[PDB]
Design a protein around this nucleic acid. Structure first.
Lengths: 215, 225
RNA sequence: GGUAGAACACGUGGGAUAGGGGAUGACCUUGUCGACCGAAACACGGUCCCCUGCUCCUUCGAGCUGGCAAGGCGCUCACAGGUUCUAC
């Protein structure tokens, strides 16, 4: 049987300056041949800790690692806005080497209302035969938010997609895009289009609307 | 300047083969151990294989035994990973990493590569359509406005979106792609800029899709109102 | 041709509980179980005993143990035998 490493927790959210500890338990004895890596979304992982208790050259002193038998703890004494990543423990005691499930560390922040914008379909897209109207929620916190679409004051369901960015590393905010896709005939069949956003930073749902064919 | 540049990744049919290359610069792989680790989209790091510096000894994962083969060339200073009989489970971003020196560090991977994407699908390649999301004229005369680009109907991943040929970085948000019902991918990239410069500064989004070799430089202009 | 002895290489059968108030032959190989080096997880080449023990005219010295296990050789005891040499 190979050596599996269970990481704990799978996710957490701590404030700036908080002391965050991530544990990693080996299935069996792996000596002190464990390492802690930090990976940004869509980026190459960086070596933070080697040999359980030694920090790699160039890593800030806020990162530390310790070993208690089979348990290995990666600690951040004062969390920074730039410490947003998924952290991984990897054993190098025997082959095949294995990683941990990973701990995605989030940075807790004060509630910030989003900036809501709306974009009608381009003329080029109308030439292509389709029509996608975009709704942008920029720089907010927390990540939870709800977006609804109103076509001539009528709710829509199933015909809208949404995507969420990762946390900025200087403000810890989020950005959400909501795309409502229709055919050219269905887009031209109606008149006014509205995006209604509900977020905790708001006391009332913010609605951004536009009348098609007019600017 | 230790660096690892990877190549050879792309779209492979369900069952084909593919050889990934990992060129090194700033060091010689003959004195280090070279590891391959993969990551499925949205999943954790998965150790694939490893090759040792002075014996050529290889080690593989229980899920890629027999199908995969790791190798290295000292004269060309380049590692290789030949994968055969690829299935949907192998679709992932593959990284090659250097196991650092035993005095400086331990057995940890000090230097890594940017990775290369391998998609195991029988679907076809489609170039994206780029549409401008112009800043609205009726935006309540705010201090900052938003403008962007919609990159729609492409397959497979990924696309590289920049602004002003990589000159505008602050305030840029390139949302992750969303796999829609048509089997294609669609995303947007927006940017917040001072609305007092919409009539002077030219804002252009640059979209690159290497799987289809399609580059588009779409200019974003506000409509007359 | 006899008696006796010695030096060698052997055969067979035995022997080896204990380290700082003192274990070992601190031999060779393999397996093992550990740390750490050589740009070095395996393979290759190495290191990990102050004291103490043993050896030697490296003798204010010098050389031989990271631990364990097995096998071999070695040390020791007894029984003879073999070759060579010596004395009568």
């Amino acid at each position: 049987s190979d050596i599996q490493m269970t990481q704990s927790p799978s996710s957490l959210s701590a404030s700036v300056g908080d002391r965050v500890t991530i544990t990693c338990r080996a299935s069996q004895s792996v000596s002190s041949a464990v390492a802690w890596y930090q990976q940004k979304p869509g980026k190459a992982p960086k070596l933070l800790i080697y040999s359980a208790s030694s920090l790699y050259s160039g890593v800030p002193s806020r990162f530390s690692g310790s070993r208690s038998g089979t348990d290995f703890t990666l600690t951040i004494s004062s969390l920074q806005p730039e410490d947003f990543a998924t952290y991984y423990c990897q054993q190098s005691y025997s082959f095949p080497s294995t990683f941990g499930q990973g701990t995605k560390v989030e940075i807790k922040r004060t509630v910030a209302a989003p900036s809501v914008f709306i974009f009608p379909p381009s003329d080029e897209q109308l030439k292509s035969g389709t029509a996608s109207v975009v709704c942008l929620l920029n720089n907010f916190y927390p990540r939870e938010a709800k977006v609804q679409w109103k076509v001539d004051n009528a709710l829509q369901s199933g015909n809208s997609q949404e995507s969420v960015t990762e946390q900025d590393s200087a403000d810890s905010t989020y950005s959400l895009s909501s795309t409502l896709t229709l055919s050219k005939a269905d887009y031209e069949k109606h008149k006014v289009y509205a995006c209604e956003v509900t977020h905790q930073g708001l006391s009332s749902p913010v609605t951004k609307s536009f009348n098609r064919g007019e600017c | 300047e230790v660096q690892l540049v990877e190549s050879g990744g792309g779209l492979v049919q369900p069952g084909g083969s593919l050889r990934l290359s990992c060129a090194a610069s700033g060091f010689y792989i003959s004195y280090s151990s070279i590891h391959w680790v993969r990551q499925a989209p949205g999943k954790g790091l998965e150790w694939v294989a490893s090759i040792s510096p002075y014996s050529g000894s290889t080690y593989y994962a229980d899920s890629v035994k027999g199908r995969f083969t790791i190798s290295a060339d000292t004269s060309k200073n380049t590692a290789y990973l030949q994968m055969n009989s690829l299935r949907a489970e192998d679709t992932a971003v593959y990284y090659c990493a250097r196991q650092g020196y035993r005095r400086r560090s331990g057995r940890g991977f000090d230097y890594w590569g940017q990775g290369t994407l391998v998609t195991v699908s029988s679907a076809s390649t489609k170039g994206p359509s780029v549409f401008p999301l112009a800043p609205s004229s009726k935006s309540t005369s705010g201090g900052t406005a938003a403008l962007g680009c919609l990159v729609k109907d492409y397959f497979p991943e990924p696309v590289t979106v920049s602004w002003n040929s990589g000159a505008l970085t602050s305030g840029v948000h390139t949302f992750p792609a969303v796999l829609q019902s048509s089997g294609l991918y669609s995303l947007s990239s927006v940017v917040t800029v001072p609305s007092s410069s919409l009539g002077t500064q030219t804002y252009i989004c640059n979209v690159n899709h290497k799987p289809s070799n399609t580059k588009v430089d779409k200019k974003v202009e506000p409509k007359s109102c």
